[PDB]
């Protein structure tokens, strides 16, 4: 009753990559002879939870028959007399007594993280025990160490070295029909019907790293046994998976919306000129990045926007997350602002570090007047001031690689609180004021809502749009919101 | 590998301690929260409540199985039950490949904390008859010098101690030794050559050398007082010279265990001493040695001191590297932390106690060896009971020249009488093996008539009648 | 199984410092009693990690004849009931019984922190045992104690006394000839091809360390066996395997202290035909002619404050000055600020000030002046002692630093009046160089400078674009030229 | 003491979906064998404390006849981080011996807090023991775990991911008819007169917890 190599799919590229560093030091070690070099030991896996890090560790152990070992994160961390430093070297000599062997250290960020916070506890001397333990592994082709974590930036950078932990690999998200392989594993034991199809499930499940897919087929079985009031032939149906989509949340309990708000290109009313200029954003240079290396110049870094509120600074700001389906993030203005004074510069650091790590990505900003603050702090006198929040992002956004899909886009309502160095070229180049729509573009503003509702064709579409003589794009949503409560009126 | 039949029975039983409902329980009747949960058999809090001072090693094996085997994957079956080593690994897995040039901390023996062992192998030594060891003290009453012996016995379960093994002894064999008033010291070569043939007859009789006894009496005035009181709280419990003889006897007889990596661990050996009580009698006591520290350092570093409570620690000569030994004791003002930067460290700390006793005379399971306990023993040359075939006319004689089988078989089950007959090897070894099995086992009446109808027993009584 | 003696290249200067220190008095009890000088009984090695701390100690002690008592850092203090002192007392006692001996304490920073970061009670018990037992070796027992560490500032300051640890040996990063020497002793047992050139690999890898050079040869061999695998005949490592290893891997700068020498040559900022003579007297002339200051007696100005218009001013006006030195550039920036609320505010700058004179030459760039000492140095200041510990070490490290070694600092900001006036104190900022706005004679050469790697048609006139730029700086010149490259690729689309 | 199903109301829409969560896998474990998947193990409850969170678990325990194991929140976590991991090991071992069994725990926020800026607590070695104990044991064993807490957002998000605590119920304050039902329950023994009201007495409360 153990798992194998065929037990998990979707990560077939990462499966064949990780199988080289475990089989070749153990099965055929003669390739490292007469070539001079030494076979490496550490393999580093990292990703979001629910991706199958411990599942991949147990699958490679039982398929080779090696001496598998397990070292847990919060388990071996003692405060008695330094017993964690004696139990780490106890696990290394026990793995050295049996050949071949493999150890596994999950949640390695929990054991001795980076010293930006603690810096004085016993964890400083815990990690240095692990430095001399892995470097003293002169026994060739015996022990192979693998690790798993969730945040590669919280760990100390001394582990990412030649000897102990090199050759890191990121277990990504199975988006390219990888959820079909997960559905082939889990639903092969359940009894199925003719109406179900696994190809019509992966196209609608954005994200879905794999743990919620196993929860989706179990919850679909709960809907099938719900109608049985209580010889038995239940099966499944297509409506059970559609019931499990709406009545169960995806991996969004930590943050509410990070992916999209389910919009498209034609959901903003009018503004066909900014739809053309949005094709010079990250849609353009991803599929051809060698043209800028041929032409020898960096592409555009940032486009800025400012104008009247309610003209498309949330619809078009989230339409970039749907036209390429990149690794979107959602962050508010004063939500970046923290209560601590020392966190005032590191909170923009981890956001920008996730942008270069989740390439290609889409970031945005709202209400930069709380962030720019062109005077540079109001009065002073305090233990902390409002001056490091703007002077850090103006330099960190310059210290980014051009070929890493990093950019910014703006959405403000006050053109005077923003600093002149905020609107600097090279950081925010195109000073584009968003305009109020004219009479030629305010017809498709109402049509952005009439695409989904069945409007009667006898009603004139331009008769309600002709009442606008200088209105905004959100004001015609107020009419269909007023008509949302004025249409029924008799069906209570 | 196969262990003993007694050791495998203690492993299968869990030995849990049941508890009842209480006022502190807030749960329902069909459950248990913490106060009526089943108690583990290795908790030392329940042990000292019933005045049990050790945790019954088979339960200590269970408390390390919970640390070895977990709910997680593991896939190891390590079972870390091994002898902790104080010797120095020569290869050392580092750049200091010779010990003459180089030693680091991963191969250096750590400083001995001198923590007492919480588990004993044998939990309670028991005896068979008070007339058996009465002959052993009677040897001192005739020659006035100290004696020595070896105890042959078996093992079975013990229901008083939770998951405990009790030690049963059946007979006592005495090796030839040179007695002395102060102490005793014999040659180990003639004893080992003599003990090799006794182990041959002990296999068919179902016996095993698992113990030894030595006497220490110092009679006061031979009138109203029985003996002096040498061993008390202020004096030594065991002399350091007898720790050496107890340590070599445990290493010669290992105990087989499947959980150990080397194949043998936790030797079941008893050392009993006749010393006398505090007030007025000759009551005996027994302690066995500790496995954790004393059992391995006796191969290289134990040296004799002039004090009976302590033993000297000698120096290192190019291979015999020893660590520092520390213990806590009170100074002239208060109680202080470890002081020992000085030799002659005490050896009474490295002994774990036992509970000796004699069973009730009204009932028992069996006794298996009570024939006379008055036959002259094999190697009692200091006493007058070392006779030739003149004794066989006096002892058994096939009683009154025509013996009843209820009165003849009761004398033939003696241990030293059967060990004296086969040394002459008149009978065949096949007929001798059924002779000793008839005397030690039940339903002997059908097989005793087979012995008297054989021509070998007829030649034994015919060659005895013509001789004196 | 141990390493030899001549298996270390690049560190030849520190090798000759340590061969006369710990090897020569160990094998020779004479020539010190006759000279009347007792030999030193303690050395300290420190520097960046991955430079040869644990490798050089095992190499210098093997092929000389010694005892070589090894002792690790985190392996001690992990004992129970207080026996780490007895493991230390038996360590020094057993070494002198069979003299000559070498006691190499590896990772001593994990044993002795400072007294303000003390933890429990067993940490005080092992630092006072080490300080007592270090003084007991004054009987000339021929015992040399070698101590290796990584951070010399986090160690306890009571270890450098007269007799405990007198000499300190700093191990710096290798040069282009130094990194080439380690590549020879790392490709000895490796089967190499003929297309490889080790001189070009050492010239490209500037910010590499002694541990990153082992990653360059081991990854190219692992890349080659991923290609050659089908149904061991010829495994010569090619040039493309080393070129791929330069791409997918990276040097030791994982957002640590930055080790790079990214500098541009001349005529890369437009114009400067009257400003280039003002910058040649601050980073070249203290290096080319140091005797002009020692003969007169003046202190050379190692600091120049820079401030100017938007566009340029931060890096390309400062990194184009030091073209002749091209040393390691350790810079402070935006994210290098008060991230930890205790201690790591100026202690991250204390290893920049003290190491600038120890690891000379090293150029330190200073920017973002409005985010370090804006409200703290003013008339209102800081009330409460929360974060007023920033304006003190920036001023008290000025008078304590002299012009003994090659030090250089550059301050640049967008607002010169937003910094504390004590940063502009006399004696340290006596040379004030102002970078002005580029005029019409300089803006045309800016458009010829940032259009360097482009297929530019020379038939057009770049002056006509720059003639319409009066209030438009070099950023707007970058803004007007980025849109010309957007529609140029669109013509190919 | 001996409580039943008819002692509490208000959450009857949630009480019906609880009876298919903890009684249906215990009374009929072979139904999940026919559908292939494993039965669920962990269902947790939350809301304001004092709506009968501890009385709800004792009601479904006595109405099924199974074993009822109980581990208190602020009791087993107040030890010195060494006996808590063995108490949880004794909890799952005893429930496996006398299957069918339920395991009710309360105040899991005191056992499982969140990681925040105010580090300095123990926060480990106990919940990680619960992680490695709960992901196993699914070899068609008749055991379920029931958690209870006060604040449902102070719990660690690793518990509410999959397979450990996946189903949740929100027993909150009752409505006007919910307090009317518990008013008839708590007044079944008091000999009242005919002057008392029930609908007006429930409507005049409007915020009263059970
Ligand atoms: N091939 C697969 N890829 C991704 N997920 C899978 C796959 N097969 C199964 N799964 C589901 O994903 C889950 C695996 O998650 P896992 O137990 O590894 O958590 P984890 O957080 O990765 O582990 P750790 O605590 O070590 O980080 C399983 O519960 C399983 O239902
Ligand atoms: N193309 C469009 N033009 C104008 N309005 C639109 C368009 N499409 C939808 N709307 C409506 O206008 C609203 C957009 O307002 P939005 O959320 O941008 O507020 P905002 O004040 O502009 O944002 P911010 O708070 O960033 O200023 C939506 O609620 C939507 O119904
Ligand atoms: N001359 C050299 N300088 C630096 N590193 C070298 C040199 N020659 C070889 N190396 C490589 O560097 C490694 C030795 O580094 P070392 O063990 O000293 O790490 P360190 O950071 O210097 O000290 P520590 O071990 O205390 O971290 C060897 O594995 C070797 O492959
Ligand atoms: N000779 C030059 N004159 C003007 N601009 C130039 C020149 N050479 C390059 N540039 C362009 O101008 C930009 C220089 O701007 P810089 O980085 O100095 O911003 P800054 O605001 O001046 O710096 P700081 O943040 O220190 O004020 C570069 O991005 C570069 O493309
Ligand atoms: N249906 C009901 N709704 C609300 N209260 C009830 C109901 N039935 C009985 N009660 C009363 O409410 C009390 C239930 O409170 P309970 O024992 O759950 O305390 P609790 O604080 O919720 O438990 P915990 O300590 O787990 O938080 C009982 O004493 C009972 O008299
Ligand atoms: Zn109870
Ligand atoms: Zn060693």
mmCIF file of C-alpha atoms and ligand atoms in Angstrom, chain D residues 7-9 49-55 106-107 150 182 186 210, ligand 5:
data_model
loop_
_atom_site.group_PDB
_atom_site.id
_atom_site.type_symbol
_atom_site.label_atom_id
_atom_site.label_comp_id
_atom_site.label_asym_id
_atom_site.label_seq_id
_atom_site.Cartn_x
_atom_site.Cartn_y
_atom_site.Cartn_z
ATOM 1 C CA UNK D 7 -32.287 18.758 23.660
ATOM 2 C CA UNK D 8 -31.135 21.555 21.314
ATOM 3 C CA UNK D 9 -32.503 23.290 18.238
ATOM 4 C CA UNK D 49 -18.828 30.031 22.915
ATOM 5 C CA UNK D 50 -21.872 29.023 24.906
ATOM 6 C CA UNK D 51 -24.211 28.071 22.071
ATOM 7 C CA UNK D 52 -23.657 24.503 23.276
ATOM 8 C CA UNK D 53 -20.395 23.603 21.585
ATOM 9 C CA UNK D 54 -19.444 20.989 24.191
ATOM 10 C CA UNK D 55 -23.032 19.753 24.596
ATOM 11 C CA UNK D 106 -12.275 21.817 22.201
ATOM 12 C CA UNK D 107 -10.427 25.165 22.206
ATOM 13 C CA UNK D 150 -14.212 30.277 19.530
ATOM 14 C CA UNK D 182 -34.786 26.218 23.713
ATOM 15 C CA UNK D 186 -35.309 24.561 29.639
ATOM 16 C CA UNK D 210 -28.436 29.538 24.539
HETATM 17 N N1 LIG E 5 -29.684 23.989 22.097
HETATM 18 C C1 LIG E 5 -29.019 24.735 23.014
HETATM 19 N N2 LIG E 5 -28.513 25.946 22.694
HETATM 20 C C2 LIG E 5 -27.850 26.696 23.594
HETATM 21 N N3 LIG E 5 -27.635 26.319 24.867
HETATM 22 C C3 LIG E 5 -28.087 25.127 25.324
HETATM 23 C C4 LIG E 5 -28.822 24.249 24.400
HETATM 24 N N4 LIG E 5 -29.152 23.147 25.098
HETATM 25 C C5 LIG E 5 -28.672 23.304 26.358
HETATM 26 N N5 LIG E 5 -28.038 24.483 26.493
HETATM 27 C C6 LIG E 5 -27.392 24.984 27.732
HETATM 28 O O1 LIG E 5 -26.162 25.635 27.406
HETATM 29 C C7 LIG E 5 -25.043 25.004 28.035
HETATM 30 C C8 LIG E 5 -24.047 24.551 26.975
HETATM 31 O O2 LIG E 5 -22.801 25.217 27.177
HETATM 32 P P1 LIG E 5 -21.412 24.445 26.918
HETATM 33 O O3 LIG E 5 -21.289 23.337 27.935
HETATM 34 O O4 LIG E 5 -21.315 24.130 25.445
HETATM 35 O O5 LIG E 5 -20.314 25.572 27.263
HETATM 36 P P2 LIG E 5 -19.287 26.086 26.136
HETATM 37 O O6 LIG E 5 -18.468 27.211 26.721
HETATM 38 O O7 LIG E 5 -20.060 26.302 24.856
HETATM 39 O O8 LIG E 5 -18.322 24.814 25.932
HETATM 40 P P3 LIG E 5 -16.751 25.018 25.645
HETATM 41 O O9 LIG E 5 -16.128 25.030 27.021
HETATM 42 O O10 LIG E 5 -16.377 23.822 24.803
HETATM 43 O O11 LIG E 5 -16.682 26.339 24.917
HETATM 44 C C9 LIG E 5 -25.561 23.826 28.846
HETATM 45 O O12 LIG E 5 -25.148 23.965 30.213
HETATM 46 C C10 LIG E 5 -27.075 23.815 28.653
HETATM 47 O O13 LIG E 5 -27.819 23.949 29.873
#
